[PDB]
Design a protein around this ligand. Structure first.
Ligand SMILES: [NH3+]C[C@H](O)c1ccc(O)c(O)c1
Length: 378
C-alpha cells in the first residue's frame, strides 16, 4: 500500500498551487518595481534553495524535508491570513517558496525512489502533475467566493485547516521520527550538468514552460488594446489552457510510453510552437479558444514525457539518486517562472506583441528537433 505516498504528494502539490492563485488577485488591491519583486520573490527563492534541498535529501532522507515543507507552508498561510504589511508579505512569499521547493523536490524524489518501474513511474507522475493543474483551476473560484461572502481571512483559514489535516496524515503515515542517511553517493551536480541529454531535457522543459510564462500576463493587455473585451473575457480566456493541461497530463502520463517519450516531446514542442505562432491572428475569443487549447495540451505532453525521462537517464548513466536531478528539473521550471513576466513585458514594449509571439514560436520550433537525441539506443 504505497498509494498513501502518492496521495500525500498529490495533496501537497494541490495546496501550494491553491494558495499561489488565491493570493494573486487579493493583495494588489489592498496593497511596477516593488510589485514585480513581490511576484518574483517566490520563484527566485525557490530557484535558489532547490540545490540545497537536493543535497540534503541524500543526507537525511525525504520525510524530514517533506514534513518541514508542511510546517513552513502552514506558517506562511497563517502569516498571509493575519499580516497586512509589505515586508510581512515578502517574508510570507519567501517562506512559501522555500516550502514549495522542499515539497516538490522531496515528493518527486520519493515517488521516483518508490515506483522503480519505468512505466509505473510515468503513470504516477501523470497524477502528480495533475494535482498542480487541479489547484490552478480550483483555487481562483474558491478564493473569490470565500472573499466575497465570509471575509478576507476565511480562504486562508480554510487552507490552513486543510494543511493541518495533510500534516496529520503525513505524521500518521510518513512518521518522521529519526534521521536516516541514504546508502550510496550522490553523483555531484557538476557531473550531472555536463551530461548533454539531461541538458537537452531541462532546456526543452524550460522553453516549453517559458512560453506560457511569458504568454499568460502579456495576452490580457493586447486583448484590451485590440478587442476592447470586458472584464470577464480576460478571466475566461485562459480556461481552455487550464483544462487542456489537466487532460493532456492525465492521458499522456500513460500514453507516452507506447508512442515514445522523445517523439511525444518533439510533437509537443512543434504543436506549442505552431499554436503560439497562430495566436496573434485571432480577432476575438472564438479565435483564441483553439490556440490556447493547443498550447495547454502541448505543455501537458512535454512535462509528462520529460519527467520520467530525467529519472530514466539518471538510472541509466549515473547512481540511482533522484533528489539532485529533480532539483535540476525544479530549477528549470523556476527559470521560466521567475524572469518570465518582466522580460516578456520589456520585449512587448520594445517590439510588438505579435513579434514576441513569433520569436517564441520560432525558438520552440527550432529547438524541437533536438529531442531526437533522447531516443533509446535499441
Ligand atoms: N508546470 C505547469 C505549467 O507551467 C502550467 C501551469 C499553469 C497552466 O495554466 C498551464 O497551462 C501550464
Amino acid at each position: 500500500s504505497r498509494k498513501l505516498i502518492l496521495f500525500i504528494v498529490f495533496l501537497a502539490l494541490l495546496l501550494d498551487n491553491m494558495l499561489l492563485t488565491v493570493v494573486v488577485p487579493i493583495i494588489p488591491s489592498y496593497l511596477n518595481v516593488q510589485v514585480g519583486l513581490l511576484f518574483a520573490s517566490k520563484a527566485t527563492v525557490q530557484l535558489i534553495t532547490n540545490p540545497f534541498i537536493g543535497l540534503l535529501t541524500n543526507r537525511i532522507g525525504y520525510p524530514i524535508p517533506i514534513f518541514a515543507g508542511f510546517c513552513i507552508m502552514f506558517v506562511s498561510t497563517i502569516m498571509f491570513a493575519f499580516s497586512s504589511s509589505y515586508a510581512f508579505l515578502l517574508i510570507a512569499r519567501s517562506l512559501q517558496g522555500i516550502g514549495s521547493s522542499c515539497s516538490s523536490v522531496a515528493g518527486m524524489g520519493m515517488l521516483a525512489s518508490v515506483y522503480t518501474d519505468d512505466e509505473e513511474r510515468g503513470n504516477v507522475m501523470g497524477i502528480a502533475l495533475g494535482g498542480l493543474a487541479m489547484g490552478v483551476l480550483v483555487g481562483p473560484p474558491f478564493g473569490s467566493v470565500l472573499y466575497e461572502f465570509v471575509g478576507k481571512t476565511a480562504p486562508f483559514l480554510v487552507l490552513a485547516a486543510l494543511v493541518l489535516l495533510d500534516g496529520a496524515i503525513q505524521l500518521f503515515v510518513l512518521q518522521p521520527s529519526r534521521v536516516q542517511p541514504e546508502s550510496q553517493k550522490g553523483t555531484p551536480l557538476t557531473t550531472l550538468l555536463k551530461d548533454p541529454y539531461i541538458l537537452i531535457a531541462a532546456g526543452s522543459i524550460c522553453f516549453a514552460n517559458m512560453g506560457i510564462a511569458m504568454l499568460e500576463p502579456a495576452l490580457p493587455i493586447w486583448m484590451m488594446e485590440t478587442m476592447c473585451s470586458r472584464k470577464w473575457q480576460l478571466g475566461v480566456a485562459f480556461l481552455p489552457a487550464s483544462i487542456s493541461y489537466l487532460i493532456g497530463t492525465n492521458i499522456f502520463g500513460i500514453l507516452a510510453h507506447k508512442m515514445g517519450r522523445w517523439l511525444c516531446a518533439l510533437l509537443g514542442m512543434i504543436i506549442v510552437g505552431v499554436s503560439i505562432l497562430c495566436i496573434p491572428f485571432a480577432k476575438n475569443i472564438y479565435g483564441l479558444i483553439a490556440p490556447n487549447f493547443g498550447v495547454g495540451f502541448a505543455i501537458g505532453m512535454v512535462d509528462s514525457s520529460m519527467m520520467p525521462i530525467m529519472g530514466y537517464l539518471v538510472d541509466l548513466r549515473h547512481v540511482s539518486v533522484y533528489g539532485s536531478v529533480y532539483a535540476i528539473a525544479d530549477v528549470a521550471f523556476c527559470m521560466g517562472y521567475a524572469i518570465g513576466p518582466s522580460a516578456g513585458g520589456a520585449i512587448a514594449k520594445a517590439i510588438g506583441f505579435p513579434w514576441l509571439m513569433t520569436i517564441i514560436g520560432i525558438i520552440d520550433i527550432l529547438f524541437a528537433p533536438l529531442c531526437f537525441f533522447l531516443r533509446s539506443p535499441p
